[PDB]
Write a protein of this length. Sequence first.
Lengths: 304, 304
Amino acid sequence: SGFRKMAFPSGKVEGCMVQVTCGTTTLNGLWLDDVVYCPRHVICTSEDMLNPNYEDLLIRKSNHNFLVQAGNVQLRVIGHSMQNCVLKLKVDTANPKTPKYKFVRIQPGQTFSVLACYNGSPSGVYQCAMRPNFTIKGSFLNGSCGSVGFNIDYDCVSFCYMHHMELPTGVHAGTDLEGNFYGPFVDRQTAQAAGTDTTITVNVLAWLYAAVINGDRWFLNRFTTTLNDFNLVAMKYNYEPLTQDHVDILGPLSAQTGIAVLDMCASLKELLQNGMNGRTILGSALLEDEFTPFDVVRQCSGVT
Amino acid sequence: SGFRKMAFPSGKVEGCMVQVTCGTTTLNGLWLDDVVYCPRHVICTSEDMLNPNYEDLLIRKSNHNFLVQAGNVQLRVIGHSMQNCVLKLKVDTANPKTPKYKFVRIQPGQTFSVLACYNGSPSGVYQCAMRPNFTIKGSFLNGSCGSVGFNIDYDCVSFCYMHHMELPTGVHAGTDLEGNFYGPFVDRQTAQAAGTDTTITVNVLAWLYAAVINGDRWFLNRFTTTLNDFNLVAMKYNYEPLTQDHVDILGPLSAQTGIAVLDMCASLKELLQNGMNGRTILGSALLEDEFTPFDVVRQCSGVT
Ligand SMILES: *CC(=O)N1CCN(Cc2cccc(C)c2)CC1
Ligand SMILES: *CC(=O)N1CCN(Cc2cccc(C)c2)CC1
């Protein structure tokens, strides 16, 4: 029993982190096989960051200008290329700690673990969600860029995020491992405002299911609703619209608890309309939206 | 910027987890050098758990009855002993992945990471605090026993917790790695109620400092207080008394922010007396007490 904001064990990713230095700029890289992936802004001075021409800046860089250190051992760079907003550095040595891996581009509302790193060294691990506005609410200081987000399926790491940017509002933007930004963001020191941070409705409902499974049941009421009726309330409260696909995805939690998805929708409706009245659910005084239905099943079933 | 509930990277501990099976009971063990540490209740049937005599039960067990598996490789048990509520299994092979380590017995209010494991396999990592009633609010299913809590100082893992028990109220009890329970709990299926779960005041104040550093400042007010005056309010709200030792420990956060500890006490006082009025601090609608002053400094300074 108990329900915690839980990250994947980070060991397999820890074994992949390196330091990348180009001139005076140091950030983190991800060493998989004989390729080191890092943000392309490693090649910039902060002077460059106002309006960098990455293709022009990269012409001035040779393989020997990319200093790649894995622990206290230097890797030999034998090629480099830009793919979107990441650099790929070819090294002469396959990472012996390379796990089974994939590169995935996640959807908004999907959760992942971040291994925060500085100078190629792991500092901590936490759980994030890709927000509906394609930002993430992370914990990233200067030097953290190139830190990655991932999911683990038994022995396979799916890398979904690399950290590139802090918006002036203190939220985070980054890329998949093909170097494509989530959302409309660019690796430029410019006016970039996030859109509406809407609540991930399917995640809240999953977490209400997690609450019932763990004995927090005070919010269960006598009501039901319809998708259309619920969605009128969701709109009013900046909640994502709930789709039949979302209902289908909650089916297993519905089955385990015997609470129909639309009945749990009606509980959520009353919580939105009435608030918590100073009560808590799984130790929270607000509705948590950074657990997926898959996350709730996993934590409630104990998958390794 | 941003502030997250952050666990230590778990790789060094992942390399230490094994499966221990005694007859039909399987839980987790911690393999350090040539010793596997696990809860002594591995030797019980659930029949035994009402009033087990561990010394008598252990007489019936030989080295060959303790099946220890590290990945899919079996370890040879060459000795076994009971120390308090843990078994120490001597194996013929030093764990090659043994990190620099210590065993520490933590104080209430201290935070640590848990690597939740099932059948010797890591499932997830989260951050806990030893509560003032010597319980922890964890996420532990059947098979999770022998999962450990730890802190990391650069390259040294300090193991502070092993998971043994769920109280009927769904909170968690366990031992240090000398097998001494935190609090008054016993490894017996009996009536064991937790005392008052008081709020860790010094941790709340640290997290208010973390909020100010990260731009959440609405709760800062025009007031100060005294330790004695604050402590009258702390008592009323089931907050731990604040000591001058706590004030001394907050000194660095005081210095960084230029907010006197007693001024931040007066902010906390008004928050206790007035509530959040539907506002949030670092994405929370309640006062977070599972970050130590050391944790706030680390996350705010980026230690690896
Ligand atoms: C994440 C990290 O380490 N950072 C330090 C370098 N910064 C460079 C930068 C890139 C893109 C936009 C801006 C404004 C700055 C990024 C943060
Ligand atoms: C943590 C875990 O894996 N558990 C399964 C075995 N249970 C045995 C037990 C020990 C002490 C008290 C009780 C009531 C049960 C513990 C939980």
